[PDB]
A paper describes a structure:
(PET27) and Kaistella jeonii (PET30) showed depolymerizing activity on polycaprolactone (PCL), amorphous PET foil and on the polyester polyurethane Impranil® DLN. PET30, annotated as a potential lipase, was derived from the published genome sequence of Kaistella jeonii NCTC 13459.
Activity tests confirmed that it was not affected in its activities using pNP-C6 or PET foil. The structure was solved at 2.1 Å resolution, containing one monomer in the asymmetric unit, with 16.2% for Rwork and 21.9% for Rfree. The PET30ΔPorC protein shows a canonical α/β-fold consisting of a central twisted β-sheet composed of 9 β-strands flanked by 7 α-helices on both sides, as already reported for homologous structures, i.e., PETases and cutinases. The structure of PET30ΔPorC revealed an extra β-sheet (β10) which is located at the C-terminus and connects the PorC domain which has been deleted in this construct. PET30ΔPorC represents the overall fold of several PETases as revealed by a similarity search performed by PDBeFold. One disulfide bond is present in PET30ΔPorC (C262-C285), a common feature for Type II PET-degrading enzymes. PET30 shows a less hydrophobic surrounding of the catalytic pocket when compared to the structures of Type I and Type II PET-degrading enzymes.
Numbering used by the authors: 6 to 278
Amino acid sequence: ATVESLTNPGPYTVATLSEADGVRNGPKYAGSTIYYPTNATPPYASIAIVPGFTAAPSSVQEWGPFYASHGIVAIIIGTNSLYDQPEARALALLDALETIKQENGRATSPLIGKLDVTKLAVSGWSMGGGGAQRAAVLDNTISAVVALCPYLTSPQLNHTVPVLIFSGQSDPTAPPSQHANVHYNTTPGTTNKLLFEVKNGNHSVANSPTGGGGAVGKLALSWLKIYLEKNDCYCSVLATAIVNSTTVSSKISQSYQCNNALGVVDSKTRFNL
Ligand SMILES: [K+]
Ligand SMILES: [K+]
Ligand SMILES: [K+]
Ligand SMILES: [K+]
């Protein structure tokens, strides 16, 4: 229940599963690795993560052990090129979530009976981060979105899913003024949302929780503890992590509501260089 609880490595032991073990082969993506805690108390929430178009899962793979070491199952999927559009990326993520849902009943799976399939999140890089936010539109029962330097040009983001957007100030591929910032502002004002731009960060800056000197992981994990796991003890943690993280940011926009130990906080603050 403190910003110290956001340490990389968390406390749980991490193991992995894949199609090599019998995991469902989802038709809408190319390969999965499931990172899961071996010694957390069931059930576990899950997050599905997808890299940008053409990019291999190794580009975002450090999120897997990070989230799983904190009790959150992570399914990282690859792509074979299909369509150069963030909407095929949304459907890939939804198919990854179906793989998680089936995994909860898969005979011989170490995760049989251990997944809370109503606590599902999505995350993605570049067009995968546009896809993650569109996945929330297409399936508004998803519990959180973590977008990593998202790319999506003509966004309709009509959803109520708490969404955390990371961006890179120096991102040439998905420049924040044309992407992340627009995604933040077109998401409904009543939707819980948070925008964090890494000062001088390139397009890859949120590909690992170590981005922003660790700020990326601290904010992402706090966000999921609150909105995916429904653990209000992490409301004040996120707030502290945000203040602590301003040193490495060039822009923060907050518009989210959160219950702490003493009451309700409706944060709408903005930081700019
Ligand atoms: K496949
Ligand atoms: K799979
Ligand atoms: K705050
Ligand atoms: K809001």
